[PDB]
A paper describes a structure:
Gastric infection by H. pylori depends on the expression of a nickel-dependent urease in the cytoplasm of the bacteria. The ure gene cluster is comprises seven genes, two of which code for a nickel-dependent urease (ureA and ureB) that hydrolyzes urea into NH3 and CO2, one for a pH-gated urea channel (ureI) that delivers host gastric urea to urease in the bacterial cytoplasm, and four for cytoplasmic accessory proteins involved in nickel processing. Ureases (EC 3.5.1.5) are amidohydrolases found in bacteria, algae, plants and fungi with an active site composed of a carbamylated lysine (KCX)14 coordinating a bi-nickel center. The overall single-particle cryo-EM structures of H. pylori urease reveal a 1.1 MDa dodecameric complex of 12 UreA and 12 UreB subunits in a tetrahedral arrangement, in agreement with the previously published crystal structures.
The map at 2.5 Å resolution depicts urease with BME bound in the active site (U-BME) whereas the map at 2.0 Å details the binding of an inhibitor 2-{[1-(3,5-dimethylphenyl)-1H-imidazol-2-yl]sulfanyl}-N-hydroxyacetamide (U-SHA). Briefly, we used the program Relion to obtain maps of U-BME with a resolution of 2.55 Å and of U-SHA with a resolution of 2.09 Å. BME coordinates to the two Ni2+ ions through its sulfur in a fashion similar as described for BME binding to Bacillus pasteurii urease, however, we see density for only one BME molecule, whereas Bacillus pasteurii urease shows density for two BME molecules. Nevertheless, BME and the hydroxamic acid moiety of SHA assume similar conformations, probably driven by the requirements of Ni2+ coordination. The structures of H. pylori urease with bound BME and SHA display the same overall fold, with low backbone variations for subunit UreA (below 1 Å), although the C-terminal residues A228-238 show slightly higher root mean square deviation (RMSD) values (below 1.5 Å).
Numbering used by the authors:
A (entry chain H), C (entry chain N): 1 to 569
B (entry chain M), E (entry chain A): 1 to 238
D (entry chain R): 115 to 456
């Protein structure tokens, strides 16, 4: 029995229970809630340290011996913020807890046994979160995938065939042959992938064929015609096949207004993209659907957080993508009904209130694929600066707000697209898609990505250097990124129907192929920490937003965190 | 003889009861098995004699064993002895309820309860609705039935009951005799509020938009107390 | 929001948090520690109740829909004493918790979803424990298996070939051909089965062949010669194959005393049968090994609890099985050195102290296969009557003592024989071997046995009766006991080596075949609630037993609970 | 020829094996009991002594169907299993049929609502399987006419149509006159005797855990038993209104007494009303055929197996029962199962 | 009742004994089965009454049947009746030894033996060795144990006992009480004289060359009475 000062203990093994750590350069403070360690029995790797033959590596290991163990990791998950060791076996998370050798240490369970087959990854002073999930990908260029990978995203869900004009507008992979093209192209990449089909048709047979061809759901986009008939048919087919539907509603109100669209949805599960409407949607009041029980409301990162440069940038961006002219009054009228700084301001507060549940990209289609996580944490920091600490906090920390915002890109999109049994959280039994963060760089620049239980990307110095640290340091592909190893580390998500018909063997796919499930029986109440339903009213004239009778707004930010301190460009 | 399996089982039971009666004659205090068997064998023999009705045997099964005839703890373990016996008019089930009275202190499986009450449906506000059964038949409604879709013969302000259930103990029920009028408490249905079945009046997400469809469907199908405004506007999916 | 009196609430749904229930006719009081239910959302089956289409059975179930759910069960396990719903899917325990329909109820997770494919089993007012595990079976007659089944035992581990004299003495199935005989006979029974080989040889090849032929371990029995050489060889082979060794030591001290046997064991894992020594073992001091770290000490039920009739009964039993004569002084000297009422008395207290960790049978070989659980709870009741309530209790209950004694026949034998990843406890992921008890009959007569997730045995009235309750009621085989269903509900445990060589396909076995694992790296510290190591001294003259310098003894009982109140014979 | 075995039948009666279509598979020991009484086919549902099975003849879901189908390999009985019809999910209904069930049971304990009835009938029409129903005694979602409206003129097999075993109180028995209904009765109510009413009352108080000090439980019990409908049921059997006799085994019914109580009802009806007017001669041949059809050919037609079993006809399965006339209807001589003595 | 298979078996046994007692009352001389069952049923009933101990029942089982109550030959066939009965303190085994005395001449399976003795281990010369148990625990040695490798607490001239076993009847044993001193006879082990096991002191062919290795191993492991000369020369395989 010896006494150790908290300072040297934290320097050796990381923060322990009751300690607090700042996240990046923000004002969000994370407090360690619990510790799974036995004081005096910590796992350390190095010369003369504990992780050695006969001390912490067992000479008589259990049969569930780990392949990889992450020691002294601070886990930031929606299930809690705590210190533990993470054991990885066969691409899954095998255990969370103490970890070590049962011959020499007390509290070691068989699923956390370190033996001669175990690799050691030091996590002391580091944060472990689940890999991010981006559910609004326009597959416009393959170069988006490495960019999203380097920011902490491990699953991309969306649609497209490339730089075609249909893809530049829509997240749609249309038809069986184009699905086959994209599924065979997917074998290249270090990313979990799933593809959305075209929902914009009234032909049930055409809808069903795309699902059986491997798509995990439908996208309904106004550029292919978002009409109530197509919405109704697509929802009927999706209910028969248990796949998700995403919608980009009619901004022009051509076939009807927002209530007509809700009537076409008819109380069935729907995932709405850019619900605030700058990215498209019933002008000016698409944002009202974010209070409905059957809606899963997502936002795209270009509108968060609301800043002084946001409105002009979005205006000029809209004038370019739609080829509008400033000398035409009708184009101006369209643009003014579309941007609405009022709804953009309201969107940040709705994220703080838990009304919006998912953050996404809309990549290269008015969105930045490498900035979903960064803009989510910028929004959290701005909201804490404006509204102060949340009232759901328990202690001098921001743990509740941290969980609320972390769920927006990890667990809620996974639940929304029926993959939350594989990815989305640091839980035992799930796929080992993990991101290592140093707290000083949290939310902007990760340390390394573990994909399928193996290291796939990391910061790395020059190959000729005597150690891995010296400059230049940038993100480089690791061994799970190469050869036949990438087939074991990566998943292609398909529908249950396509999986049952042997889509993997028919198309000769070497990646893991998994079916999505539980997409039709979820509501807004199934989103973690973002399950607030409310009556949202939008003023047709002033465009003001009222939630439960009270006006909701935020003020723009002239400076954000996690932006110019961390990037050269 | 052409004995059936039932006859072999009943013969075994008769001789278990015979052993119990012999031990009782010897002065041994009977245990659980012996008491059960003695009651069952007595009922079977009485039904064979054919001089008593089944109800008489149900009452007579309670006088066979005094509390002093059994071991401590036996009386509290025998809630009911059921036995099927063949009377002159065929096979009838005779059940004896609490045949033996408790006299000791031993209670196997005794429950030691806290005296605090349980608060069910906490955080749910209850409204009160007056309901009358204008039909000629009794109606009973369980705790988790969607009260908007109860028997169309019940009359009440259905609009106020949409998306609600009875604020009573789970698995209990409220009865409505023909012509009976009483008020009940209704709480909001929890979870995802996805109402499927019950009369096919909703079969979708419960909300204000679907309440209009439900009210219109209820009025078309003659559910009492339904007042959905005329000039109804249909949606694309009804 | 309504108030419900505790009395009517408990009558409807069983005891809740803070309530206490007596176990059988004993003095042990169990307190419900926690409840997983939401008050007002309990699952009840019947006419007009909750478990109906659209209310608690989902009309849009998750894809992990349960096959069977046990509602409002009081779980008594070493992991705790609490109220929950148990969901069973595909022969495993799929979930423990709330259970129900997510459409109409708040706290329902996907693994506890009740849908149209779910069967309902009411457990309100009932106790659920894991199936018992008996690890000292002499396979002398097949009729032992139904007898142990009706008492709450779901796994039998032992050896034998039938009523042969070698089996009447030893739990040994000797050699490959006899192993094949017993493995093919096992296809008949409703019981998990595993067989021990002959360890009494100095030939390593002969030892290895038996393990590769399907045995899960060795028995070393003095009737085949318990010599240090055979012990050493058997332990070496077992360490190479990861199987357990059980030992019945030399009562005659022919090759050495108890310390010579411990020297032959040489600090390796060993499971000792009838460690107190009435069933055999170094006279008079075999019981001292129960304090060693590498020993897993078990007791057989004929010596517990110690009663007024115990000594004379054991004396006469010994005179019969060994064909001794009362007119021969050497036979008397052997008998007196063997019985030792002192060690028998000490054994009960050692069970109370956690020194002894496993209770077993020694069936039809001085032991009663249908009385392991009953005599365990009789010992617990006697110890509470003598020594009062344990000092490790937290509250006006006996929860700690209940867990300590329940571990002796559920989880500790499973850990000892390397099957604790399949059976031994009510935990998610484990095999659904469950026993339903009414608290008035707890520990002596169960309600029903669930085997492999299906009902295999239950109390049942006559088949011609209008309801299942009327007399005569006795234990009858259910549907999992018959046809090809019994092959899906039952496991034959084999060694990892035999499993890898396709023992299932070679012998044409239709039962599930599973390998034992983690047998060599466990010590006394791996036993739940029974991990007390101590220095045990036995007086060579007075046969008194001292633990850590203090004399340990118990007094005999002239009357026990759970005996004459519950049985006609 | 030389390959023929001889069985003497002089002075004996040969009937087809009985068919019991209301089995609660609560205990396997029911099967030998029904076998010894002359029943050779049992149709029903259940998984064992579980509370859902103690109430309903339902084998719910693919996995439980697989359990029971593999257990069935043990027994000397023709077996078929009913699935759960109490759902509004068409995919769940269809999966159970494709998993081996021969039909659906709709039971009020799982919720007999018009929506579930409608969906189950739609799926059954798509798969050509029978539907059996135990209607809502509490009139919770509607009365008997609402149930008939949900049935919408499609084929339905009603269990214990007189209603002591469950059903719209007090008037479920009216559906026994409809063209699309196959009305069955359970043996505990036939024949009507002096001990019937009290026995059924006490049985109901036990299975539903009712209390005599609660007026609502008494009101439920009185609306349920109705000695009037029980008395009417015997005459309706004599008139040919009721068409099938069944058991409701260990769920207020006796699996070894279907045939015996059928012939007891026939004997009681002949004692009360005399010889039927459809007789041709100084015999009871017409009445004998009418009552024999109630447990042999009518249930086989109802559950779509009347091309295999149900009658002594050339081409059919040799499921035959040998009776000595002195013991006819209570204790048979031998059972021939699949053309061999079982 | 929840009867177990054991309870059904014991009920059958009780009524077999009841039949035996009825026949004995009628004056019939009991046969083997009837006598066994009568004794067993009497013991079970006495244990149920709970007024006697198991030892009392062991003595009482011998007074139930006089020799004149059974058929000729019955007494010599019933060596011992064992029966497990449930007392107030649980289940105990009661065995009655030679319950009935022989009175006739009929002996089923009677053995007619030659009066000549059997000479065992013929052709084997026996040596005599004095052995003392200096330990505090009893030691018992069987007929075919390699006597060189007995418990190290026994003290005797081990060199003279190498390759030998006790010259006693096969399957018998010699006991050594703590402090006891006695002489025993040892004969040479037969067959191939390949000694494996027993303490791992030889584990090879027995001969003069291996006796030196065995003596050295015994001395190193503290076997009493072992005098192997110092300056031991090891071989290439030890
Ligand atoms: Ni869009
Ligand atoms: Ni987009
Ligand atoms: Ni033993
Ligand atoms: Ni043994
Ligand atoms: Ni029914
Ligand atoms: Ni029924």
């Amino acid at each position: 029995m010896k006494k150790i000062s908290r300072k040297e203990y934290v320097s050796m093994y990381g923060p322990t229970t009751g300690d607090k750590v700042r996240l990046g350069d923000t004002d969000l403070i994370a407090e360690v809630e619990h510790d799974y360690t036995i004081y005096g029995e910590e796992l350390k790797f190095g010369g003369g340290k504990t992780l050695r033959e006969g001390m912490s590596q067992s000479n008589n290991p259990s049969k569930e011996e780990l392949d990889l163990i992450i020691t002294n990791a601070l886990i930031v998950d929606y299930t809690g913020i705590y210190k533990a060791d993470i054991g990885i076996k066969d691409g899954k998370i095998a255990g969370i807890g103490k970890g070590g050798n049962k011959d020499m240490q007390d509290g070691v369970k068989n699923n956390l046994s370190v033996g001669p087959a175990t690799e050691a990854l030091a996590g002391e002073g580091l944060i472990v979160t689940a890999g991010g999930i981006d559910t609004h990908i326009h597959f416009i260029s393959p170069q988006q995938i490495p960019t999203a990978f380097a920011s902490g995203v491990t699953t991309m869900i969306g649609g497209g065939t490339g730089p075609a004009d249909g893809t530049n507008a829509t997240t749609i992979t249309p038809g069986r042959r184009n699905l086959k093209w994209m599924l065979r192209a997917a074998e290249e990449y270090s990313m979990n992938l799933g593809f959305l089909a075209k929902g914009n048709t009234s032909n049930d047979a055409s809808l069903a064929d795309q699902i059986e061809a491997g798509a995990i759901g439908f996208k309904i986009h106004e550029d292919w015609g978002t009409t109530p008939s197509a919405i109704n048919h697509a929802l009927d087919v999706a209910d028969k096949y248990d796949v998700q539907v995403a919608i980009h509603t009619d901004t022009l109100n051509e076939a009807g207004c927002v209530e007509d669209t809700m009537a076409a949805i008819a109380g069935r599960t729907m995932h709405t993209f850019h619900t605030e409407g700058a990215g498209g949607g019933h002008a000016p009041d698409i944002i009202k659907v974010a209070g409905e029980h059957n809606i899963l409301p997502a936002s795209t990162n270009p509108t968060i957080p609301f800043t002084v440069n946001t409105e002009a940038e979005h205006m000029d961006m809209l004038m370019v993508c739609h080829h509008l002219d400033k000398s035409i009054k009708e184009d101006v009228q369209f643009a003014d009904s579309r941007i609405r700084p009022q709804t953009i301001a309201a969107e940040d507060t709705l994220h703080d209130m838990g009304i919006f549940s998912i953050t996404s990209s809309d990549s290269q289609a008015m969105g930045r694929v490498g900035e979903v996580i960064t803009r989510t944490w910028q929004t959290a920091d701005k909201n804490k600066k404006e509204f102060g600490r949340l009232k759901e906090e328990k202690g001098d920390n921001d743990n509740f707000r941290i969980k609320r915002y972390l769920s927006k890109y990890t667990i809620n999109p996974a639940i929304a697209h029926g993959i939350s049994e594989y990815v989305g959280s640091v839980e035992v039994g799930k796929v080992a898609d993990l991101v290592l963060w140093s707290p000083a760089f949290f939310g902007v620049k990760p340390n390394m990505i573990i994909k399928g239980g193996f290291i796939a990307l990391s910061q790395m110095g020059d190959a000729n250097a005597s150690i891995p640290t010296p400059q230049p340091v940038y993100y480089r592909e690791m061994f799970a990124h190469h050869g036949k190893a990438k087939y074991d580390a990566n998943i292609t998500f398909v529908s249950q129907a396509a999986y049952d018909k042997g889509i993997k063997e028919e198309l000769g796919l070497e990646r893991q192929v998994l079916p999505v499930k539980n997409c039709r029986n979820i509501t807004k109440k199934d989103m973690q920490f973002n399950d607030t339903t409310a009556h949202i009213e939008v003023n047709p004239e002033t465009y003001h937003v009222f939630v439960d009778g009270k006006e909701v707004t935020s003020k723009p930010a002239n400076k954000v965190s996690l932006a110019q301190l961390f990037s050269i460009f | 003889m052409k004995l059936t399996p039932k006859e072999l089982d009943k013969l075994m039971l008769h001789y278990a009861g015979e052993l119990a009666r012999k031990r009782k004659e010897k002065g041994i205090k009977l245990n659980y098995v012996e008491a059960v068997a003695l009651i069952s064998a007595h009922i079977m023999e009485e039904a064979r004699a054919g001089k008593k009705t089944a109800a008489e045997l149900m009452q007579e099964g309670r006088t066979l064993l005094k509390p002093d005839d059994v071991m401590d703890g036996v009386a509290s373990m025998i809630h009911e002895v059921g036995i099927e016996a063949m009377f002159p008019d065929g096979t009838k089930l005779v059940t004896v309820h609490t045949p033996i009275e408790a006299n000791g202190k031993l209670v196997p499986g005794e429950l030691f309860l806290k005296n605090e009450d349980i608060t069910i449906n906490e955080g749910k506000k209850a409204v009160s609705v007056k309901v009358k059964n204008v039909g000629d038949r009794p109606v009973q409604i369980g705790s988790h039935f969607h009260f908007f879709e109860v028997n169309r013969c019940l009359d009440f302000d259905r609009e106020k009951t949409f998306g609600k259930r009875l604020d009573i103990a789970s698995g209990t029920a409220v009865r409505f005799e023909p012509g009976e009028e009483k008020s009940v408490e209704l709480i909001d249905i929890g979870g995802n509020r996805r109402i499927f079945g019950f009369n096919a009046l909703v079969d979708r997400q419960a909300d204000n938009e679907s309440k209009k469809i439900a009210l219109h469907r209820a009025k078309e199908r003659g559910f009492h107390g339904t007042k959905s405004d005329d000039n109804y506007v249909k949606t694309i999916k009804e």
